[PDB]
Design a protein around this ligand. Structure first.
Ligand SMILES: O=C(OCc1ccccc1)c1cn2c(=O)n(Cc3ccccc3)c(=O)cc2s1
Ligand SMILES: [Ca+2]
Ligand SMILES: [Ca+2]
Ligand SMILES: [Ca+2]
Ligand SMILES: [Zn+2]
Ligand SMILES: [Zn+2]
Length: 167
């Protein structure tokens, strides 16, 4: 017999993602770079590894859409809900949807795709929202103006509670 796992986490360390479509706001290359860096945020502090697929079903299916886009979490135009992602699991599990009514950038203007993706992939991996305003997993986007990204300790603790450290 088998009982359901008690924790919403990935039970495999080598995970796949696929960019199902692209925002008009950034080049294919910039979008790819943003997501790759966002995954690195998590792989840097856990044993998880991430590989991009160009076809088929990946663990984390990434897409851009607006308003109603095929689930119970419709978007709302500019600002507000920026994106959402499903907890670890089969099918919809892990998938990450981005609101293309946002202005996505690789800069400090609009919403930084890398930053929002890092947050969303947190959800994809099993983290809910933090109550710490300084945490990556805090619900509200607050770009600090700082030059280099650093994953806050709250988020390190959260993700390691599920997977432990890389080594
Ligand atoms: O706002 C946040 O978390 C909450 C959230 C994020 C995304 C979507 C919804 C909610 C965070 C913002 N930041 C940062 O602006 N910076 C500085 C920085 C960022 C990008 C590139 C370079 C340097 C950090 O190092 C860390 C964080 S965490
Ligand atoms: Ca929105
Ligand atoms: Ca999935
Ligand atoms: Ca857009
Ligand atoms: Zn959605
Ligand atoms: Zn969130």
């Amino acid at each position: 017999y088998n009982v359901f796992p008690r924790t919403l986490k990935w039970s495999k360390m080598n995970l796949t993602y696929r960019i199902v479509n692209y925002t008009p706001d950034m080049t294919h290359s910039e979008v790819e770079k943003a997501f790759k860096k966002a995954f690195k945020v998590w792989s840097d502090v856990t044993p998880l590894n991430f590989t991009r697929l160009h076809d088929g079903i990946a663990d984390i299916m990434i897409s851009f859409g607006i308003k109603e886009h095929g689930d119970f979490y419709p978007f709302d135009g500019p600002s507000g809900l920026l994106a959402h992602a499903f907890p670890p699991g089969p099918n919809y599990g892990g998938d990450a949807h981005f609101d293309d009514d946002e202005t996505w950038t690789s800069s400090s203007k609009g919403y930084n795709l890398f930053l929002v993706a890092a947050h969303e992939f947190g959800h994809s991996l099993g983290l809910d929202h933090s109550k710490d305003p300084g945490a990556l997993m805090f619900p509200i986007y607050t770009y600090t103006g700082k030059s280099h990204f650093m994953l806050p300790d709250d988020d390190v603790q959260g993700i390691q509670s599920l997977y432990g450290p890389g080594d």
